[PDB]
Curated annotation (Swiss-Prot):
This is Manganese ABC transporter substrate-binding lipoprotein PsaA. Changing N141S: In strain: NA-1383/97. Zn(2+) can bind to PsaA but cannot be transported by the permease into the cytoplasm. At high Zn(2+) concentrations, Zn(2+) binding competes for Mn(2+) transport impairing growth and rendering S.pneumoniae hypersensitive to oxidative and polymorphonuclear leukocyte-mediated killing. It comes from Streptococcus pneumoniae serotype 4 (strain ATCC BAA-334 / TIGR4). Changing E211D: In strain: NA-1383/97.
Amino acid sequence: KKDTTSGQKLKVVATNSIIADITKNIAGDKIDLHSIVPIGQDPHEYEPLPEDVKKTSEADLIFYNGINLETGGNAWFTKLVENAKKTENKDYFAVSDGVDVIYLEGQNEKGKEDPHAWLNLENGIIFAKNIAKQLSAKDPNNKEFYEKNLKEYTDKLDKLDKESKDKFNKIPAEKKLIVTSEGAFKYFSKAYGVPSAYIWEINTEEEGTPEQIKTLVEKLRQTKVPSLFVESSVDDRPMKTVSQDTNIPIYAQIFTDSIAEQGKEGDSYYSMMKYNLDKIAEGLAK
Ligand SMILES: [Zn+2]
């Protein structure tokens, strides 16, 4: 589509820092990249700022999660691309295309998917493949470079994934449960064999009401779970109350919907996943 050598770098927009980071690993300095949702902020419901609107409108390529991630705020991503006059599978692409979808509990229809596919490293590899292919389709002069970066990156994710299938077999069955504010661990639970439980299933619902806290506390009181976890991108008040009512300490802050701030541990898709795996493993062995 574009002969970037005879003009500007490809202009790329990613909806959140996880997709942006994977993108940076594939494209390097070949592109101009803008990420919309700030590090540490919820990507489910976001209100685009003037710079997001400008960059999205000037973009050659737009990557979003798809599978019911950016749909809060009465479909914020949908309104953004409508306003920027961009077309699906021409200008903007879901990087989850090709993952095996898991839906919200008791649901199975389109638009009711659980969006947290990247917490399974096999799906992070699928995100990178979609990104590299769409980068190469739009900027064919840099295809060998994107492909070389893709192979090195998926090899690195693949080694971490294989090695991480050994992580939780030592945890006693009564300790074996990941607890987070949002129910964002469905793909991770399936991939790494560790059940998960939450305060609220997906960020677009209610914010950690007293009923939701009480429901998790009562479930937790029937277990031997030694640690709780709190995500970097949600209010930690709900989990602190759960922690206080159950007497179970919050072992660590983890990463779900955002990478960590630049320079801190977890500041990339790879390192947030590596971090998550180790801290959950330590936390559940307490
Ligand atoms: Zn989420």
